[PDB]
Curated annotation (Swiss-Prot), chain A:
It comes from the Eukaryota. The gene is INS. The chain holds residues 88 to 108 of 108 of the full protein. This is Insulin A chain. Disulfide bonds join C6-C11.
Length: 21, 30
């Protein structure tokens, strides 16, 4: 999930936007 | 800002700034 992609590993704008509505 | 380890309130704030008026969903356990 998001914690795995952005917290435990380095985040990116591409991934963050996957969580916008 | 965006390209680093973002956890907890730090991650929530990034989603807030990036998504803007579109809003977002935060699911810690998924």
């Amino acid at each position: 999930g998001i914690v795995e992609q952005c917290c435990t590993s380095i985040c990116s704008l591409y991934q963050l936007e996957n969580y916008c509505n | 800002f965006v390209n680093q380890h973002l956890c907890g309130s730090h991650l929530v704030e990034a989603l807030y700034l990036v998504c803007g008026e579109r809003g977002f969903f935060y699911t810690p356990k998924a």
